Every structure is written in structure tokens, then in C-alpha cells.
Amino acid sequence: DAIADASKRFSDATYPIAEKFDWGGSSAIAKYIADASAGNPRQAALAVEKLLEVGLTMDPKLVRAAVEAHSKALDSAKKNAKLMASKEDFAAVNEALARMIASADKQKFAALRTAFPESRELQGKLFAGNNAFEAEKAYDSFKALTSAVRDASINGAKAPVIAEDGPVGRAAKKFSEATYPIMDKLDWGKSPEISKYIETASAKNPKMMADGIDKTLEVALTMNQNAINDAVFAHVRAIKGALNTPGLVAERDDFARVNLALAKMIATADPAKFKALLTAFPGNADLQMALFAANNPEQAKAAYETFVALTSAVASS
Numbered sequence: 569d570a571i572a573d574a575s576k577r578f579s580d581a582t583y584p585i586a587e588k589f590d591w592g593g594s595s596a597i598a599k600y601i602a603d604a605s606a607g608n609p610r611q612a613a614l615a616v617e618k619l620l621e622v623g624l625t626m627d628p629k630l631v632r633a634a635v636e637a638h639s640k641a642l643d644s645a646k647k648n649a650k651l652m653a654s655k656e657d658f659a660a661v662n663e664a665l666a667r668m669i670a671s672a673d674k675q676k677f678a679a680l681r682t683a684f685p686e687s688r689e690l691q692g693k694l695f696a697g698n699n700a701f702e703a704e705k706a707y708d709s710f711k712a713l714t715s716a717v718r719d720a721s722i723n724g725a726k727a728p729v730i731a732e733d734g735p736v737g738r739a740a741k742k743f744s745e746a747t748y749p750i751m752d753k754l755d756w757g758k759s760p761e762i763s764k765y766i767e768t769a770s771a772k773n774p775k776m777m778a779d780g781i782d783k784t785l786e787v788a789l790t791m792n793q794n795a796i797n798d799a800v801f802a803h804v805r806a807i808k809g810a811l812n813t814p815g816l817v818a819e820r821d822d823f824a825r826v827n828l829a830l831a832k833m834i835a836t837a838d839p840a841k842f843k844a845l846l847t848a849f850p851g852n853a854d855l856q857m858a859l860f861a862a863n864n865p866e867q868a869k870a871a872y873e874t875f876v877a878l879t880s881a882v883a884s885s
């Protein structure tokens with residue numbers, strides 16, 4: 569069909585550019601994500617809120633296929649030093665995304681183009697690192713794909729219904745109560761350790777990072793999609809309640825709702841696979857020591873006890 573053929577053309581046009589891109593290093597993308605909120609923290613937080621809302625307008629079946637496609641492509645990418653997928657897996661990632669975007673609310677989706685801060689300076693840097701004639705040809709093929717997708721769009725008509733707690737519920741409230749005082753002292757619009765990790769982590773061990781991403785997607789595919797939708801919406805609500813507060817500190821009720829929603833979503837994952845993510849990413853132990861070093865020692869240790877308690881309640885459910 570129209571999408572399939574346009575996607576094919578887009579894939580053809582972009583694969584050669586993709587082959588020259590530094591997927592695993594500290595590219596202009598790694599540095600842009602790392603510093604994006606430094607400029608306008610509120611705009612960055614609102615953008616994330618819009619990103620999740622758009623995701624909430626999509627057809628879960630197509631979201632799932634799109635994620636499956638990335639996981640399958642990682643299987644081939646994570647074996648070579650360039651983290652470069654096969655032309656086959658690559659073309660399949662694009663067609664799955666084209667179909668998933670066809671199910672999204674059109675206006676909300678198109679609005680993501682201008683939602684993130686300074687995405688224009690990033691795009692200019694990405695172009696400067698590509699062959700200009702090549703990227704131009706790719707962009708014209710991208711436009712033709714967007715039209716095929718727009719023409720085929722169901723405009724969010726399959727958005728999932730979203731709702732809007734025995735031992736789990738109780739253990740989550742204690743966890744919330746013990747972590748809120750730690751959360752409320754941090755500046756979520758300026759988190760030095762996390763930014764530095766995002767900026768430099770992959771470059772140090774690209775293969776392990778691609779594997780970590782892959783395992784994470786893999787774990788996500790074992791979760792109950794309605795629970796995924798609930799947790800995602802819980803965060804959309806939290807952010808709205810956090811946007812005007814210094815440091816983007818969540819409101820107490822929103823924060824609790826997020827932890828409960830996550831607890832439930834994690835209860836639905838493959839346990840060994842979820843558990844294993846703890847050691848899946850490169851440099852995570854060192855990242856956690858640095859995050860811990862920024863917190864009140866006492867309160868964090870006290871919180872860890874509630875964290876272990878919640879982990880058990882969830883395992884029993």
C-alpha cells in the first residue's frame with residue numbers, strides 16, 4: 569500500500585546516512601538530551617508531557633509492534649561496533665513506526681516538531697554532519713512518507729481507554745511517604761548526575777548500552793499494556809501538577825499515584841527479566857552511588873527499606 573511503498577522509499581534514502589551516524593557515541597543527540605532542560609526547563613518538561621499524551625492517542629497494538637520491531641533490529645545492531653541494524657530490520661522499523669504514527673492524533677503528533685527546546689540548533693548540527701545532497705534527498709522522501717501516513721490516518725480513534733492495592737497499595741504509600749522528602753529536595757530540571765550519564769554513558773560501552781536498551785524493550789513487551797497506559801498517564805498528570813513548582817517537584821498525591829501505577833505495571837512484567845535490568849546498563853552502579861551521594865544518607869537508607877518492602881509486595885501479586 570501507499571505507506572509500505574513510501575516507507576520503502578524512505579528506508580532506501582536513509583539507510584546510507586544511518587550507516588555513517590555515530591549511534592553509540594556522544595553525538596550531537598547525546599549532548600542535546602543531556603543539556604536540553606538547562607536552557608528552558610519548563611519547556612522541556614511540557615514537551616515530555618506532550619510526548620506521553622501523543623503516545624496515549626496511539627493504537628496499543630501498533631505501539632507494541634513498533635517496539636517489537638526496534639527490539640528485533642537491536643538483535644542485529646548490537647553485534648557490530650557501529651550498532652547498525654540490517655537493511656531488513658531497518659526498513660521494518662520504519663514501516664512499523666509509520667503505521668503506529670498513522671493511528672496517532674494528528675495535531676498532537678505534528679506538534680512534537682516544535683515542542684522540545686532548541687531542537688533547531690540540533691537539527692542544524694545533524695545536517696552539518698551529513699552529506700547535504702544526501703540529507704536533502706532523504707528529507708524529500710520523508711515528506712512523501714508523512715503524506716502517505718496522513719492520508720491513511722485514523723487520527724487517534726484507537727486510543728486506549730484509561731482508568732485515571734492490597735499489600736501493594738499499602739507498601740507503595742509507605743514508599744511514597746519515604747521518598748517524597750528526598751524527591752522534594754532535588755531540582756528535576758537540573759539533574760547533574762543524570763545529564764552527565766546520558767551525555768557520556770553510551771560512548772564508553774556502546775554494545776552494552778544497546779543491549780541494555782534491548783533488554784528494557786524486551787521487558788516492556790512482557791508488561792500488561794493497560795498498566796503501561798495507566799502509569800504513563802499517571803506521569804502526564806504529575807508533570808502538569810509540577811510545571812509551576814520550583815525544581816519541577818511533584819505534588820504529593822500525583823507522586824503517590826505514579827508510584828502505585830508503576831508498582832502495578834512492574835507486577836505484570838517477567839520478574840527475572842525486570843530484576844535483571846539493574847545490571848544491564850553500563851556504569852549504572854557508579855551512577856547510583858553518585859545519585860545516593862547527593863541525598864541525605866539517613867533518609868535514603870530509610871527509604872531503601874520501604875523500597876525493599878514494596879519490591880516484595882509486588883513480587884507477591
Ligand SMILES: CCCCCCCCCCCCCCCCCC(=O)OC[C@H](CO[C@@H]1O[C@H](CO[C@H]2O[C@H](CO)[C@H](O)[C@H](O)[C@H]2O)[C@H](O)[C@H](O)[C@H]1O)OC(=O)CCCCCCCCCCCCCCCCC
Nearest residue numbers: 582583585586589680681682687698703704706707710781
Ligand atoms: C529508547 C527507549 C524507549 C524510549 C521511548 C520512545 C522515545 C521515542 C522518541 C522520542 C523523541 C521524538 C520527539 C520529537 C522530535 C522532533 C523531530 C522533528 O520534528 O524533526 C522534524 C524534521 C523536519 O524538520 C523541519 O524541516 C523543515 C525543513 O524545510 C526547510 O528546507 C526545506 C527543503 O525542502 C524547504 O527549503 C523549507 O522551505 C525549509 O524551511 C523546516 O526547517 C522546519 O522548521 C523543521 O522543523 O524531520 C526531519 O528532519 C526528518 C529527517 C530528514 C532526513 C534527513 C537525514 C536522514 C536522517 C538519517 C538518520 C537515520 C535514521 C533513519 C531516519 C530517521 C528519521 C530522522
Ligand SMILES: CCCCCCCCCCCCCCCCCC(=O)OC[C@H](CO[C@@H]1O[C@H](CO[C@H]2O[C@H](CO)[C@H](O)[C@H](O)[C@H]2O)[C@H](O)[C@H](O)[C@H]1O)OC(=O)CCCCCCCCCCCCCCCCC
Nearest residue numbers: 747748750751845846849852853854856868869871872875
Ligand atoms: C520516555 C517514556 C518511557 C521512560 C522510560 C525510562 C524510565 C527511566 C529508567 C528506567 C530504566 C531502568 C534500568 C536501570 C535501573 C536504574 C535504577 C536502579 O539502579 O535502581 C536501583 C537502585 C540501585 O540498586 C541498589 O544498588 C545497591 C548497590 O549498593 C551495594 O553496592 C554498592 C556499590 O555499587 C555499595 O558497595 C553498597 O554498600 C552495597 O549495598 C544495592 O545493591 C541495593 O540492594 C540496590 O537496590 O536503587 C534504588 O533506586 C532504590 C532507592 C531506594 C530509595 C532511596 C532514595 C530514592 C529517592 C528518589 C527520589 C524520588 C523518586 C522515587 C523514585 C524511586 C527511586 C528508587
Ligand code: CLA
Nearest residue numbers: 591597601616631634635638665684687762765766781785
Ligand atoms: C533504541 C534506539 C532508538 C534510537 C537510536 C532512535 C533514534 C531516533 N528516533 Mg526512534 N524510537 C525508539 C527507539 C530509538 N529511536 C523506540 C523504542 C520508539 C517507540 C516505538 C521510537 C519511536 C520514534 C518516533 C515516533 C519517532 C522517532 C524518531 C527518532 C529520530 C529522532 C530522535 C530525536 O529527535 O532525537 C532528539 C530527541 C528529542 C528531540 C526529544 C527526546 C525526548 C526523550 C525521549 C525524553 C526522555 C524522558 C525520560 C523520562 C528520561 C529518562 C532518563 C534516564 C536516564 C533516567 C532518531 C533517528 C522521531 C523522528 O524520526 O523524527 C523526525 C520520530 O518521529 N522514534
Ligand code: CLA
Nearest residue numbers: 601616620756766784796799800803830834849852855859
Ligand atoms: C517525565 C519524567 C520522568 C522522570 C524524571 C523519571 C525518572 C526516574 N524514573 Mg520513571 N518513568 C517515566 C517518566 C519519568 N521517570 C515514564 C513515562 C515511565 C513509563 C510509565 C517511567 C517508568 C519507570 C520505571 C518502570 C522505573 C522508572 C525509574 C525511574 C528512576 C530511574 C533512576 C536511574 O538512575 O535510571 C538510570 C537509567 C538507566 C541505567 C537506563 C535508562 C534507559 C531508558 C530507556 C532511557 C530513555 C531515554 C534516553 C535518553 C533515550 C532517548 C531515546 C530517544 C531519543 C529515541 C528515576 C527516578 C526506575 C526506578 O525508579 O528504579 C528504582 C524504574 O524502576 N521509571
Ligand SMILES: CC(=O)O[C@H]1CC(C)(C)C(=C=C/C(C)=C/C=C/C=C/C=C(C)/C=C2C=C(/C=C/[C@@]34O[C@]3(C)C[C@@H](O)CC4(C)C)C(=O)O/2)[C@](C)(O)C1
Nearest residue numbers: 619620622623624631677678679680681711714796797800
Ligand atoms: C501509552 C504508551 O505506551 O506511551 C508510550 C508510547 C511510545 C510509542 C512507546 C512512546 C513514544 C514515542 C513518541 C510518542 C514519539 C513521538 C514522535 C513525534 C514526532 C513528530 C514529528 C517528527 C513531527 C513532524 C511534523 C513535521 C511536519 C513537517 C512539515 O510541516 C513542515 C515543516 C513543512 C511542510 O511543507 C511539510 C511537512 C512535512 C508537512 C515533521 O517534519 O515532523 C513513549 C514516549 O514511550 C510513550
Ligand SMILES: CC(=O)O[C@H]1CC(C)(C)C(=C=C/C(C)=C/C=C/C=C/C=C(C)/C=C2C=C(/C=C/[C@@]34O[C@]3(C)C[C@@H](O)CC4(C)C)C(=O)O/2)[C@](C)(O)C1
Nearest residue numbers: 591597598691692694695698703704707765766769770777
Ligand atoms: C540512558 C541513555 O543514555 O540512553 C541512551 C540511549 C541511546 C539510544 C544509546 C542514545 C542514542 C542515540 C540517538 C537517540 C541517536 C539519534 C540520532 C538521530 C539522528 C537524526 C538526524 C541525522 C536528523 C537529521 C535531520 C536533518 C535535517 C536536515 C535539514 O533540515 C536542515 C538542517 C536544513 C534543511 O534546509 C534541509 C534538511 C536536509 C531537511 C539531517 O540532515 O539529519 C543516547 C543518546 O546515547 C542515550
Ligand SMILES: CC(=O)O[C@H]1CC(C)(C)C(=C=C/C(C)=C/C=C/C=C/C=C(C)/C=C2C=C(/C=C/[C@@]34O[C@]3(C)C[C@@H](O)CC4(C)C)C(=O)O/2)[C@](C)(O)C1
Nearest residue numbers: 591641642645651652653661674677678713714717718778
Ligand atoms: C544505539 C543503537 O542501538 O542505535 C541503533 C538502534 C536501531 C533501532 C537498531 C537503529 C535504527 C533505526 C532507527 C533509529 C529508525 C528510526 C526511524 C524513525 C522514523 C520516524 C518517522 C517515520 C517519523 C514520522 C513522522 C511523521 C509525521 C507525520 C505527520 O505529522 C505530519 C508531518 C503532519 C500531520 O498532520 C500528520 C502526521 C501523519 C501525524 C511521519 O509520518 O513519520 C540503528 C540505526 O541500528 C541504530
Ligand SMILES: CC(=O)O[C@H]1CC(C)(C)C(=C=C/C(C)=C/C=C/C=C/C=C(C)/C=C2C=C(/C=C/[C@@]34O[C@]3(C)C[C@@H](O)CC4(C)C)C(=O)O/2)[C@](C)(O)C1
Nearest residue numbers: 613756806807810816817818830839842843878879882883
Ligand atoms: C522534568 C520533570 O517534570 O520532572 C518531574 C517529573 C515527575 C514525573 C512529575 C516527577 C516524578 C515522579 C517520579 C520521577 C517517580 C518515580 C517513581 C519510580 C518508581 C520506581 C519503582 C517503584 C521501581 C520498582 C522496581 C521494582 C522491582 C521489583 C522487582 O525486581 C525486584 C527487586 C525483584 C524481582 O524478582 C521482582 C520484581 C517485583 C520484578 C519495584 O517493585 O518497584 C518529579 C519528581 O516531579 C519530577
Ligand SMILES: CC(=O)O[C@H]1CC(C)(C)C(=C=C/C(C)=C/C=C/C=C/C=C(C)/C=C2C=C(/C=C/[C@@]34O[C@]3(C)C[C@@H](O)CC4(C)C)C(=O)O/2)[C@](C)(O)C1
Nearest residue numbers: 631632635784785787788789796842843844845846876879
Ligand atoms: C510496548 C511499550 O509501550 O513499551 C514501552 C513501555 C514503557 C513503560 C513506556 C517503557 C518503559 C520503561 C521501562 C520498561 C522501565 C523499566 C525499568 C526497570 C527497572 C528495574 C530495576 C530498578 C530493577 C532493580 C532490581 C533491583 C534489585 C534489588 C535487590 O536484589 C538486590 C540488589 C539485593 C537484594 O538483597 C534486595 C533486592 C532489592 C531484591 C533493584 O534494586 O532495582 C518504554 C521503554 O517506553 C517501552
Ligand SMILES: CC(=O)O[C@H]1CC(C)(C)C(=C=C/C(C)=C/C=C/C=C/C=C(C)/C=C2C=C(/C=C/[C@@]34O[C@]3(C)C[C@@H](O)CC4(C)C)C(=O)O/2)[C@](C)(O)C1
Nearest residue numbers: 601604605612613756759762856857859860863868869872
Ligand atoms: C529532551 C529532554 O528534554 O530531555 C530531558 C527530559 C527531562 C525529563 C527533563 C530530564 C530529566 C530528569 C531526570 C530523568 C531525572 C532523574 C532523576 C533520578 C534520580 C534518581 C535517584 C535520586 C536515585 C537514587 C538511588 C539511590 C540509591 C541509594 C543506595 O543504593 C545506594 C547507592 C547504595 C546502597 O548501599 C544504599 C542505597 C541508599 C539504597 C539514591 O539514593 O537515589 C532531562 C535529564 O533533562 C532530559
Ligand SMILES: [Mg+2]
Nearest residue numbers: 639640643782
Ligand atoms: Mg531484541
